[PDB]
Amino acid sequence: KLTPAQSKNPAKNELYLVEGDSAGGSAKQGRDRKFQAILPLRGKVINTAKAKMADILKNEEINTMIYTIGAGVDFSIEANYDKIIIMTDADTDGAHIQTLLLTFFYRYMRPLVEAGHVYIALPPLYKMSKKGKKEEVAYAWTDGELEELRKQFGKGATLQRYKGLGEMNADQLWETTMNPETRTLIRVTIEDLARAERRVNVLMGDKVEPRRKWIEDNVKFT
Amino acid sequence: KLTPAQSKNPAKNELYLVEGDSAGGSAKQGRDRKFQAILPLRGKVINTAKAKMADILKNEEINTMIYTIGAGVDFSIEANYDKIIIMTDADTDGAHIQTLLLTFFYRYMRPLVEAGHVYIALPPLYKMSKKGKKEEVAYAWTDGELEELRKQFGKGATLQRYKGLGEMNADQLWETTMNPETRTLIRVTIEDLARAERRVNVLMGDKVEPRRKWIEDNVKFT
Amino acid sequence: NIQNMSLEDIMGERFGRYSKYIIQDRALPDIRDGLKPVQRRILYSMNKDSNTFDKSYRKSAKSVGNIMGNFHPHGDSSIYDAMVRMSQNWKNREILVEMHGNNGSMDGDPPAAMRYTEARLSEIAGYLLQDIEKKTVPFAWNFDDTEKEPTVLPAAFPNLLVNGSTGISAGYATDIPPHNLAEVIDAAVYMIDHPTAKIDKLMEFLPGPDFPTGAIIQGRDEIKKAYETGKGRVVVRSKTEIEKLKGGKEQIVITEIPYEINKANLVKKIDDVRVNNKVAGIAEVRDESDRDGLRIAIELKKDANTELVLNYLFKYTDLQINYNFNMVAIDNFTPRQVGIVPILSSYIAHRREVILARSRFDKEKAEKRLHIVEGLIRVISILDEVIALIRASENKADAKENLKVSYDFTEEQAEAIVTLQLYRLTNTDVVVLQEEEAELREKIAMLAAIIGDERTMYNLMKKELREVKKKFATPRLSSLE
Amino acid sequence: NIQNMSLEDIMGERFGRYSKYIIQDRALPDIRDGLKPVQRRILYSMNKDSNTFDKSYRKSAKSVGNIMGNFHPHGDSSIYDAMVRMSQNWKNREILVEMHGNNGSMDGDPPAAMRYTEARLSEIAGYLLQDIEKKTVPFAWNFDDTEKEPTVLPAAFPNLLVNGSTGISAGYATDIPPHNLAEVIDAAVYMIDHPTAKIDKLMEFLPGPDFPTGAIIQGRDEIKKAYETGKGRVVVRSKTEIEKLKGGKEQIVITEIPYEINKANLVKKIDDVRVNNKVAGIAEVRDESDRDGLRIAIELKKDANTELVLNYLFKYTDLQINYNFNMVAIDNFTPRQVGIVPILSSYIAHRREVILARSRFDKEKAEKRLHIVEGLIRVISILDEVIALIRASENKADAKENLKVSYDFTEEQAEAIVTLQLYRLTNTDVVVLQEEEAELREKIAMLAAIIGDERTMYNLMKKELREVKKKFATPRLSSLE
């Protein structure tokens, strides 16, 4: 089940795919309802590289995505949002979920990505604060930015490492990752196609022995 | 859903009504399956003094009791167990559940109680122990019995106060409250009828102002 | 292996146990600190765990597991939901737990599970706990008999009237509305000076409730009745504006709704009125509320029946509801139905006992330190001899006995002397000591004063009450008409 | 407010992160202590919380909330289920958590929620934790950066082979069967003496696995293959008896089933064979297992096709299954597929580092105490002067400096002297001190010996390993055919 935008406008309408019924709640609360819709995914998304077609279409998450978006899957295209934004935890499992959704969009909704309609959101990894009624807070996304903040807040200031979306309120979610003016998104492009297809199939695919090799070759577990 | 006895015998067959899906598990595990059946109640039982008939028969717990027992509710009688044993936590909520079930049996299955077929089980309130491979344990049910045990185990021995059935294993449940040879049950009788009916209606009934008075008169919250 | 009881006895004894517990230990608030046992345990636990406002939020699950394993023998869900509620500005006038994460909303959405959220006590909650470590308040054992728990909190403001309570047991129920901290304080203060404060004048300071949701409250007469007896019906009416709409269209705007109602559902029902056309001024219904503000837009079409249609909703939807006061609290271990006077008087009587006990505690601590300091002062004059005598003894205990017998020091004095470390000898200033002495002797006199002088005692209550007023006061949200 | 990445890069970097974490930090066991990160955190946490075997059980929820808030950033369900599993004698050969309450069963019933159960570490689990407070093992920071956690446990027996592990990540999976503590120990001990122990002789001590569920295991050749390479299929066959049945009827009885299978379901399928009459010896099927014993009765009717029908079940039901060894562990931060030799050798190499570090720690502690004791011995000879000098100084720091400069004591020595309490002067026995001195000097020599002598070191490993053998050894349950 999906939380709609108040108005229909294929031109400036945002579909947030959120990891968690719970974060989905927060996203619903903190957001411009005039034009952003929310669609939470309950747990891990089906792997559409490794499955049969039957299983895929019978899956609740996939079908609701398909229906809410419109096009289909052939796909057609513009219906029905001008941004499909994947919003998850900045942790390993969130990373896993982006992999799973991108595989889906890549395999079935391919034109969506090509026209640059698929984004990934960047929740802040850090919050800085310095008691009570006069508590001040800043947000940082990177190694460097944090370095910036700590010198500004100097000592006494304590740091939070966000372990997930659940840990932040609704206004915060707005301020840092949802408000078009202040938010920072990544835009997924494909440069080539064949290169992409190979990668997606080695990682997300049924066979394994190749994934293992990919991992031995590329994953540096030091 | 109910966990049956292996054989059908209206003569020596026990139906345990247990408070909790979870304790029901333990009871299933620790028990003589040759002739004792288990029927867990999920949460608070409908109050059958305060409800309409519709609500009552549409209730899952009541209907499964009725079906498993046989008779009906008119009742008829012997089908189908020779003991219906109410087994709950020795705490306030368990006490509440006994009230609710007795009201039901009293109001619909009345002959069951009259022929002395309804029991209440007495889980032990205390366990005594004195480390590791050589740990010894005893059980007590009362003010006095505990006094007995502590002198026997003397000092060093530590006492547990059972806050519920969940806190005890399956063999323990057998040893202390289910094994006919060692268990102690209370047998519910009715002495009079009118006296009973009045009490059940004042306590369990719809009106209230009288319950309040009963409480002001009899509950001594010091 | 078999006992017999009548059904008559089983019912009475069982039901009695359940009812008593439901009344005292579950559903109903103590009249003094305004708390139900779960709430109190939540606070007491988070505070003991140094999980206060001025430190980092902690993983809700840890707090709950801790409350559950030490104090509260019931389910995690019960504890956690109660916790969440204490963190909801729309339910409590002064929030007592601050939470990070999805913790519900007015549209009634499910709060996130304890495995997501993070919590801490709020600043004002620390005030309910103030002085709890100075033996100011009755303690009992937990179920383990492994630790002690408060039966009531010190309560440095009057939480009962402020956050209110509801409220369902056996035999009684309770509904108490939130009130404005500043106002309540003002009444209490008056009643301290004029104990026989009649209700009428009290109303002058404390008039009607103050809902977090704001809105409009009608029924002064009814409010008086509630504050007098314990029971009353008051009318609560959501707050409206009018907007003019380019094109000869008029818009109805709502910016505060009644306490305890599901905004999402209110909207749906307002819409349902339109679909079924139960009234004519119907047009479109839109909920346009975002982070940081509630806005409900019901804009009508041509025939702007505005005052007609608005009036219809007040009747048929919850845009207007009534609220009932049923003020029931636990006083002397038993349920009482109470109006403002008893509530205020018992709160005062409670602070009295607390302030007395606090002082008795601080006094004792001081006389003990004084007694020691007097000892040290003497020690200095005979230091060489005392050191010698100690070197000459056989062990700690023997040295102590020799100081007592020989120089007439007390046990507490000898113990303090004998445990001094060597570097302490580095300072043998009688003067520094005498200064401490004089300071102590003055703490003691002042405490002795608070203790044996109902008037100075009550003056302290007032000073303290006013300090809390300044720090936490906020303007009214509800209006009275 | 916008970046661009190719889908090619996003996938690679994301998947890489997930896989690495899944492999190291989630699904796979460390080759040394045989633990997955969740398990290790559970143990480490319960132990830090003094929730050991010799103290009272604690409310599961508290333990979990604690693990979750301090060490393990994942869901309570994951932690708790992992906890429950460590408490199941049918899944682990040596249980590491003891639990009170419904914690599942072989018939696969749902364990009770954490709000019901109570737990503590078992006795043998304390052995995995042995010496953890003597800096014997690498620590890292938790996610908060508020506390430190072990990356591996000291592991005083070889948990990997004993309890086994399974076992699903990205790219690799792991299945390791339980083994008999005593046997594993015996092999390890041999390998310590003869490092180049060939597999064949090792098998003589460690032959095939030992499932908690007992049963019968066939495939010596296959077992050799698994112990050699890492991979093998072995056959596991439930244990049967025959009963003669008054009336020319024969009964098939089963009293041990294969590892990791749902007894309730096994029964149901055996019954299903009868209903569909997939075989003729069919009669009645009954599960008659109670607390304290597993008994499965399949009694046949007239035409007692016993050996025929029994043989059919072994095929078509799980009364007989196969088990596959896929021994994958984390060695040097990366997944390796391993046979018995690498597992044993790395475990030994680990105890070496642990025993060395333990000794280095105990040595330092001792030399520090010695250094102080030597100081005290001197102090006594000049006590009067030293006391005087201290009285003459200006504060702690000044007295310290004077002792150093004047009598050449070290900082650590001065600090110890200057903090002595007065009663300590009650005893100025050089002799008592010298005794301690001699004792220390002997602890030190012996430690120095363990440290610089691979042989004595390895001898210690053996002594310790054998002590654990005597205390925890239990007879085999699985048989090898």
Next chain:
DNA sequence: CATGAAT
């Protein structure tokens, strides 16, 4: 038709 500590 719910409210909120309990099962």
Next chain:
DNA sequence: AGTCATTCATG
């Protein structure tokens, strides 16, 4: 991590 029913008082 939703959904599902029930106690208890009350309007």
Next chain:
DNA sequence: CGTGCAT
């Protein structure tokens, strides 16, 4: 067909 840490 199901295993067990994760969502």
Next chain:
DNA sequence: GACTATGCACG
């Protein structure tokens, strides 16, 4: 407090 679907490897 039960049930409900997914990833990951593998036989």
